[PDB]
Swiss-Prot record:
Belongs to the TRAFAC class TrmE-Era-EngA-EngB-Septin-like GTPase superfamily. FeoB GTPase (TC 9.A.8) family. It comes from Legionella pneumophila. It is found in: Cell inner membrane. The chain holds residues 2 to 256 of 751 of the full protein. GTP 2 binds at residues 32-36. GTP 3 binds at residues 53-56. It comes from the Bacteria. GTP 1 binds at residues 7-14. GTP binds at residues 111-114, 140-142. Residues 1-160 form the FeoB-type G domain. This is Fe(2+) transporter FeoB.
């Protein structure tokens, strides 16, 4: 069973990678580019788990930032391990909310709990999980704390997640729902149409994609700005419920 590992840069993503895969890991190039790909695997009982590390990115919309953007559509994977840094929850969940729009299983690895605590940051894990609708597994990858539970949660990471409920203008919701339907008629599968619409809305470039993009500009609405805000408000609201100081 195949797990992509995703997060923002500098979140201990590599350390978690090392913690999970140990010496059973290797480096090559991503296909036809210079960026190095790291892959590895671990046994979890009789179960094999393969893991592909993605280069960190704030947002799915810069050669590295590009690889991650296309791998979550290009690759065949069964679930995502979204690594979050507890100390920068609000930023790090921007990516998370975007990932939930893939309709693929996600488990959150809530890393740096020790640094979080040292900085007087307290996170209600049960509440974050209740809000986000996926396992949220507190860890300290650098110290191997939490790894076994995150491993355990991998075996039961087969349910897909709901996009977060975002509040957009009626004008704006209208445009995203036209865009989604245009895509379905085109022949796209539902999961992908929902996801690909949001990316377009944000102004993602990655012949048919360039026609739609000018069409979104001609509505003179700045969808990108609007969608970023609605994503931000829901996320700010989740942070204010779960995190103090």
């Amino acid at each position: 069973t195949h797990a992509l590992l995703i997060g923002n840069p500098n979140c201990g993503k590599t350390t978690l990678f090392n913690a999970l895969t140990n010496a059973n890991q290797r480096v090559g190039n991503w296909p036809g580019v210079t960026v190095e790909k790291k892959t590895g695997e671990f046994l979890l009982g009789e179960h094999l788990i393969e893991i592909t590390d993605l280069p960190g990115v704030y947002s799915l919309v810069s050669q590295d930032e590009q690889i991650a953007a296309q791998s979550v559509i290009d690759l065949e994977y069964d679930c995502i391990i979204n690594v979050i840094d507890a100390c920068h929850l609000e930023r790090h969940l921007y990516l998370t909310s975007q990932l939930f729009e893939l309709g693929k299983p996600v488990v959150v690895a809530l890393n740096m709990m020790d640094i979080a605590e040292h900085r007087g940051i307290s996170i209600d894990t049960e509440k974050l999980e209740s809000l986000l609708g996926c396992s949220v597994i507190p860890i300290q990858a650098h110290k191997n704390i939490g790894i076994p539970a995150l491993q355990q949660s991998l075996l039961h990471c087969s349910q897909k997640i709901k996009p977060l409920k975002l509040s957009l203008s009626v004008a704006a919701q209208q445009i995203l729902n036209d865009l989604e339907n245009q895509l379905i008629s085109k022949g796209y599968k539902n999961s992908f149409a929902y996801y690909f619409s949001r990316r377009l809305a944000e102004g993602d470039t990655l012949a048919f994609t360039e026609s739609l993009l000018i069409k979104l500009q001609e509505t003179e609405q700045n969808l990108d700005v609007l969608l970023a805000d609605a994503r931000y408000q829901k996320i700010h609201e989740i942070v204010t419920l779960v995190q103090k100081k």
